[PDB]
Write a protein that binds this ligand. Structure first.
Ligand SMILES: CCN(CC)c1ccc2cc(C(=O)N/C=C\N3C(=O)CCC3=O)c(=O)oc2c1
Ligand SMILES: O=P([O-])(O)O
Length: 321
């Protein structure tokens, strides 16, 4: 039985917590996971304060090589816009990229704005101020979200750009996906971007969005998977899953990654970290799907296993998988 520590992204923390609990019940191994946000996850794995870090934003091949790190994807999730609009219900409201970017720019201030009404012709929209909510902390969900906005709103692209931290034109800061969901729950008229679980968990209404191909789509586990169906995983695990073409492709989709050292200085711990994630691939898909995360295709799991064999070693050069 090992005691493992991980830290980082809150986007997949529900499924990592479920897998940890189930794995302790079946094997006795203990996994402690701190949801501090992807930027914190990368800092802690580089500082060696944890056995594994977690980030939704992928590190480049060069940066992994500079740091002696290896990265692998675990599950596919989706970012949704959780809203608090008395009078409307979950899924009823539709937004497109351009108008969602204009809300995040602070240009559209009311829920019954003409651009929102035109997208939603049968809906009685309230004359309520929009209360924008964004992340306070360095975040892989902000990286995904601002990567998407830069594709669909040129003003956003050219003035704010993409990052795990950006200069938000407007919006209150919430800490973690949990913090944004709490903000949205307490503020009439709020909008906040969160991984899907956090909207569903908190009984918050979420919007539909327009796909890259121009059709309204609902956020579901299958529609997150759909957004990855064109990903050529054989080329790289760092796949962009925002604004992807195809039927029912949720436009703000992302996978998420675990970071470990290639040279493991506590090799028994490294061996156990690999056994935990291998167990999750083998037996954990139902738990990920129960929490509305799509599983990676079996071919990607085989890619990860094969790369574990060639990249993860102890200080004597022997493989830990
Ligand atoms: C660091 C570990 N953290 C931090 C965020 C955890 C741990 C457990 C949970 C459980 C949740 C939860 O059980 N939701 C109720 C069900 N649920 C959904 O409907 C989808 C995912 C999900 O978990 C959650 O939303 O966030 C979590 C977050
Ligand atoms: O997953 P986050 O917490 O880095 O957004």
């Amino acid at each position: 039985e090992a005691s493992l520590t991980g830290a980082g992204a809150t986007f997949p923390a529900p499924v990592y917590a479920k897998w940890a609990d189930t794995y302790q019940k079946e094997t006795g191994n203990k996994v402690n996971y701190q949801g501090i946000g992807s930027s914190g996850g990368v800092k802690q794995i580089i500082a060696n304060t944890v056995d594994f870090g977690a980030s939704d934003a992928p590190l480049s091949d060069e940066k992994l090589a500079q740091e002696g790190l290896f990265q692998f994807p675990t599950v596919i999730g989706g970012v949704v816009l959780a809203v608090n609009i008395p009078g409307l219900k979950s899924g009823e409201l539709v937004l497109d990229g351009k108008t969602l970017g204009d809300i995040y720019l602070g240009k559209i201030k009311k829920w019954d704005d003409e651009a929102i009404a035109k997208l939603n012709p049968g809906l009685k929209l309230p004359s309520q101020n929009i209360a924008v909510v964004r992340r306070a902390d360095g975040s892989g969900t902000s990286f995904v979200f601002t990567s998407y906005l830069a594709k669909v709103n040129e003003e956003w692209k050219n003035n704010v750009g993409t990052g795990s931290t950006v200069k938000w034109p407007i919006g209150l800061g919430g800490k973690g996906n949990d913090g944004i969901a709490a903000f949205v729950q307490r503020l009439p008229g709020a909008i906040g971007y969160v991984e899907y679980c956090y909207a569903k968990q908190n009984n918050l209404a979420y919007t539909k969005l327009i796909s890259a191909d121009g059709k309204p789509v609902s956020p579901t586990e299958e529609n997150f998977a759909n957004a990855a169906k064109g990903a050529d995983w054989s080329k790289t695990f760092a796949q962009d899953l925002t604004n992807q073409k195809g039927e029912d492709a949720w436009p703000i989709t992302s996978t998420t990654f675990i970071l470990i050292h290639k040279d493991q200085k506590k090799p028994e711990q490294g061996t156990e970290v690999l056994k935990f994630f291998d167990w999750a691939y083998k037996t954990g898909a139902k738990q990920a799907n129960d929490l509305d995360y799509a599983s990676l295709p079996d071919s990607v799991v085989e890619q990860v296993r094969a790369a574990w064999k060639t990249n993860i070693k102890d200080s004597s050069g022997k493989p830990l998988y």
